[PDB]
Amino acid sequence: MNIFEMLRIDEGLRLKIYKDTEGYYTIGIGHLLTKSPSLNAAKSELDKAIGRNTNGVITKDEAEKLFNQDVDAAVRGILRNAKLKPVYDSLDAVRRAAAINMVFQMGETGVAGFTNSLRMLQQKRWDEAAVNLAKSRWYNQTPNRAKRVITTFRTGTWDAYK
Numbered sequence: 001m002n003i004f005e006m007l008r009i010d011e012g013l014r015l016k017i018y019k020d021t022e023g024y025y026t027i028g029i030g031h032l033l034t035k036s037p038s039l040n041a042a043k044s045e046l047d048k049a050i051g052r053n054t055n056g057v058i059t060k061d062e063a064e065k066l067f068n069q070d071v072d073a074a075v076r077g078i079l080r081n082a083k084l085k086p087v088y089d090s091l092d093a094v095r096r097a098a099a100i101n102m103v104f105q106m107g108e109t110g111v112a113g114f115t116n117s118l119r120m121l122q123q124k125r126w127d128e129a130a131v132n133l134a135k136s137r138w139y140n141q142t143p144n145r146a147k148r149v150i151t152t153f154r155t156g157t158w159d160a161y162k
């Protein structure tokens with residue numbers, strides 16, 4: 001198991017524009033296109049991202065290309081963030097995958113507001129962090145996914161994904 005396989009499980013794969021859990025236009029493997037309610041705005045963002053007139057549809061290859069870019073970007077986002085970096089550096093390989101998953105899902109902004117969880121993770125207080133992470137809109141909105149990520153931080157294994 002690795003970050004790509006993990007995220008592919010959590011996000012699925014769709015080759016036609018769709019609405020995410022929050023109702024935002026997305027495509028491929030959780031690639032958010034726009035928060036605007038306009039489908040046209042979404043198709044325009046899509047064409048700009050793929051570099052071609054897609055008509056709201058992409059191939060598997062194109063989806064996988066967006067995915068690679070997105071994972072890379074998340075990691076780099078983390079490494080660039082002064083709040084995040086130190087936490088990420090302190091973690092083991094499995095747990096780093098859980099950190100990347102959250103950043104990918106919610107943005108470095110979103111995750112950067114889990115200050116108290118961050119501190120617990122840095123201190124390696126696993127059970128406590130797990131409890132703290134669950135007290136969130138994130139967990140209440142997407143409970144099955146949050147549970148998987150949380151188990152990951154808690155155990156440092158891929159058990160929730162098998």
Ligand SMILES: Cc1ccc(C)cc1
Pocket residue numbers: 078084085087088099100102103111112114117118121
């Ligand atoms: C790097 C990192 C991001 C988010 C959390 C919750 C923990 C670590």
Ligand SMILES: [Cl-]
Pocket residue numbers: 049
């Ligand atoms: Cl893009």
Ligand SMILES: [Cl-]
Pocket residue numbers: 141142143144145146
């Ligand atoms: Cl869920």
